[PDB]
């Protein structure tokens, strides 16, 4: 009985020793000669209004012009970022929404949250109205994040400490990913789309495989819940935002942490993390009413996106890298540039 | 300036804004009540007197109440509790008879300490509900309260404790300045529980109105 636990502990020690062996000059030693990105001043080009509650999620369409925002008001507004128009106002059934996702094709938006139901709304109906195409059920806990794969497969992360890949047409759990301990608070998909990483509240992140269906790698090094996660554009690294004010950028190939983006002036948690088009800049939705954008190669803070009157809950960067929407608990989106 | 399509799109945006404003006004006219509990404590009884989130819409005295029974959640409370930052009250059912059962009142008191002192609810009143009065009286007659509260000294008869459990629930409120933990023994009461809820919610609404107004 205890022999299995002893073998597991020995394997964990061996893995830690192997990682230590692969360790070398840190990212600071490599990118020490690189010049700093310089001060980044960023103006609120647009300020979308219309929500009557706290925004909990946002996502940029593939066209980088349309974004869908979910708020505890119960509404799923689809904005037109260029002109601050509202294309649609979906009346979500359950007002407790905590995620949203814009399908790559632009024909679907997903919403979920405390209802434990992932609803797949439709946008290109012949009747000119948004009709719930399918309401996925099966998660025994609050839904945290959902992301479309191409158009029919959608992966979800819920509070039952499991991630699942669905089949929208069938409405059944095609593959279930298990192995986490705490609530899986956030999810992110690799650009290659055959891999994705999830950050659970047990202070650990895992590298899942959509195809075969098991945790390829396990990453640790945090000290609190991982409230957000995002892939590096090259699809070989990801960054996690913990509750201890520490964005950490890991690597898939080396299976190690590279930096710990921390500052003593920050003592508040993290809500969202997203890179830039090249990944040189890494944003972060700190809950102390502002978002701090840091250089992802020297860990130096390089600008502050202040201007929100409450906690910055959701943050996202466009596909072309022309803007960074930040949705705060104040009922206001805000597109920066 | 704007082409025809752009003008019609702005028309659609104005219509969407009008619908959003109307629905927001309708929602604000309603009153939201989070309902916590220790589990089995009697939330069923009070919800009858009126997957995931189990809502309940009941109206009284031309006021639309919304009770969000959240006992079905099994995840960690710290992550989704901030969703209810805006509720005007927190009904908190507690099983009085459970003092000798298994020590469940210690768990209930721990939950009360977690909820009342939570950073998200520094200004939301707690409508404490003490029910199962008949069973509590029968048990108190059978056995004293020293099983769960050895520090208590008294005749160990009902109402001789002077709602001793109620006292221990009230003093658990650390921030007594910015909230009031209303208590009310929930017997059959001839449908007076809804009345107590109404007075408590009205008091909270008055406090909110005065706080907003200058």
């Amino acid at each position: 009985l205890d022999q299995l636990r002893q073998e597991a502990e020995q394997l964990k020690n061996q893995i830690r020793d192997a990682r230590k062996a692969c360790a070398d000059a840190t990212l600071s030693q490599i990118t020490n000669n690189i010049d700093p990105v310089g001060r980044i001043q960023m103006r609120t080009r647009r300020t979308l209004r219309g929500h009557l509650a706290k925004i909990y999620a946002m996502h940029w369409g593939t066209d980088s012009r349309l974004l869908v925002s979910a708020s505890q008001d119960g509404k799923l507004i689809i904005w037109d970022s260029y002109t601050t128009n509202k294309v649609h106002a979906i009346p979500l059934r359950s007002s407790w929404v905590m995620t949203c996702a814009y399908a790559p094709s632009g024909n679907y938006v997903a919403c979920g949250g405390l209802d434990n139901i992932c609803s797949i709304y439709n946008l290109k109906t012949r009747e000119g109205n948004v009709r719930v195409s399918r309401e996925l059920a099966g998660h025994t806990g609050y839904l945290s994040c959902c992301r479309f794969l191409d158009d029919n497969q959608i992966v979800t992360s819920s509070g039952d400490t499991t991630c699942a890949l669905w089949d929208i047409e069938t409405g059944q759990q095609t593959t279930t990913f298990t192995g986490h301990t705490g609530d899986v608070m956030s999810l992110s998909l690799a650009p290659d789309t055959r891999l994705f990483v999830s950050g659970a509240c047990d202070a650990s992140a895992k590298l899942w495989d959509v195809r075969e269906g098991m945790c390829r790698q396990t990453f640790t090094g945090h000290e609190s819940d991982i409230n957000a996660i995002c892939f590096f554009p090259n699809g070989n690294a990801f960054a996690t935002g913990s509750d201890d004010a520490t964005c950490r950028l890991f690597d898939l190939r080396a299976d190690q942490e590279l930096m710990t983006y921390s500052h003593d002036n920050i003592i508040c948690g993290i809500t969202s993390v997203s890179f830039s088009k090249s990944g040189r800049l890494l944003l972060a939705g700190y809950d102390d009413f502002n978002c701090n954008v840091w250089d992802a190669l020297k860990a130096d803070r390089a600008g502050v996106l202040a201007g929100h009157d409450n906690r910055v809950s959701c943050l996202g960067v466009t596909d072309d890298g022309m803007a960074v929407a930040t949705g705060s608990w104040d009922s206001f989106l805000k597109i920066w540039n | 300036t704007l082409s025809a399509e752009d003008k019609a799109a702005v028309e659609r945006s104005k219509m969407i804004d009008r619908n959003l404003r109307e629905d927001g006004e309708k929602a604000a006219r309603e009153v939201k009540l989070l309902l916590l509990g220790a589990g089995e404590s009697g939330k069923s009884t009070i919800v009858k007197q009126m997957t995931g989130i189990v809502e309940t819409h009941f109206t009284f005295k031309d006021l639309h109440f919304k009770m969000f029974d959240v006992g079905a959640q099994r995840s960690e409370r710290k992550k989704w509790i901030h969703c209810f930052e805006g509720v005007t009250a927190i009904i908190f059912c507690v099983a009085l008879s459970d003092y000798d059962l298994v020590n469940r009142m210690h768990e209930s008191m721990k939950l009360f300490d977690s909820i009342c002192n939570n950073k998200w609810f520094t200004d939301t009143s707690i409508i404490l509900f003490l029910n199962k009065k008949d069973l509590f009286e029968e048990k108190i007659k059978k056995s004293p309260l020293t099983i769960c509260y050895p520090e208590y000294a008294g005749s160990n008869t009902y109402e001789e404790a002077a709602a001793y459990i109620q006292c221990q629930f009230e003093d658990l409120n650390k921030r007594k300045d910015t909230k009031e933990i209303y208590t009310h023994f929930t017997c059959s009461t001839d449908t007076k529980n809804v009345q107590f809820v109404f007075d408590a919610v009205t008091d909270v609404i008055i406090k909110n109105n005065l706080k907003d107004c200058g």
Epitope: D80, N85 | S3, A4, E5, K7, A9, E11, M15
Partner: single-chain antibody, 233 residues
Framework: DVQLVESGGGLVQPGGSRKLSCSAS????????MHWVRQAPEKGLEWVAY????????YYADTVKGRFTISRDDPKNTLFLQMTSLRSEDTAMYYC??????????????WGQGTTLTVSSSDIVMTQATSSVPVTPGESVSISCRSS???????????LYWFLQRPGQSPQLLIY???NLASGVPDRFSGSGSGTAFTLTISRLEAEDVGVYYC?????????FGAGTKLEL
């Protein structure tokens, strides 16, 4: 299914009045703008009137300004056009067209069956030089419709639409915004061009594509249709 049936036709004495009504059927009428397009017994189409979503702003053609009145009844899902003092030239068969306006939408998506009416006895001038052109099946054809004003707005959109009308059939949309194919249309059709110069391109023209092809501006709201190019043989 989405279907638009309009009624209120029949012979009317000149100078009289008549109400024409459209009957919506299951396409969320209240959030759909509606137009009224007329077809002369031998000539091309011509815009008549328009009522926005929610009975908001409303426009008319210069030829029928004041004379005609258009109204909608959302609870009844029915669209009314009230005409007064019908003239001899007013004889035409009137089509009932829906259109929804938002980013990426497809205005003029569906056309009603049409109501035949007979009467007893700015303004960007679009042009279709080619009146007709025969073509054998399986070949590629190109129809050019030159405008008289730059249709490329500052937003980058090119507000040109292409409509194909089968013989004795309600016209249907083919391409909107000069490049975006309609939903359900075959991929053979393709539009291109530039400001003040457009040319629809169809490759491997199969059967059931013969008919009058119309081009349409949407910049200046006194819309104008093309003369119409017919495909034969």
């Amino acid at each position: 299914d989405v279907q638009l049936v309009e009624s209120g036709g029949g012979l009317v004495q000149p100078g009289g009045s008549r109400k024409l009504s459209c009957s919506a059927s299951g396409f969320a009428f209240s959030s759909f703008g509606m137009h009224w397009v007329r077809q002369a017994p031998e000539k091309g189409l011509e815009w008549v009137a328009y009522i926005s979503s929610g009975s908001g702003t409303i426009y008319y053609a210069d030829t029928v300004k004041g004379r005609f009145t258009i109204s909608r009844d959302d609870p009844k899902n029915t669209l009314f056009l009230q005409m007064t003092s019908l003239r001899s030239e007013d004889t035409a068969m009137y089509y009932c067209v829906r259109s929804i306006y938002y980013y990426g939408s497809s205005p003029f998506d569906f056309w009603g069956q049409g109501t035949t009416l007979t009467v007893s006895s700015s303004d960007i001038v679009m042009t279709q030089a080619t009146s007709s052109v025969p073509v054998t099946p399986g070949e590629s054809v190109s129809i050019s419709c030159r405008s008289s004003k730059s249709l490329l707005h500052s937003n980058g959109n090119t507000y040109l639409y292409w409509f194909l009308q089968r013989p004795g059939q309600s016209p249907q949309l083919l391409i909107y915004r000069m490049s975006n194919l309609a939903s359900g249309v075959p991929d053979r059709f393709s539009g291109s061009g530039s400001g003040t110069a457009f040319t629809l391109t169809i490759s491997r023209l199969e059967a059931e594509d013969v008919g009058v092809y119309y081009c349409m501006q949407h910049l200046e709201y006194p819309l104008t249709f093309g003369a119409g190019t017919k495909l034969e043989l």
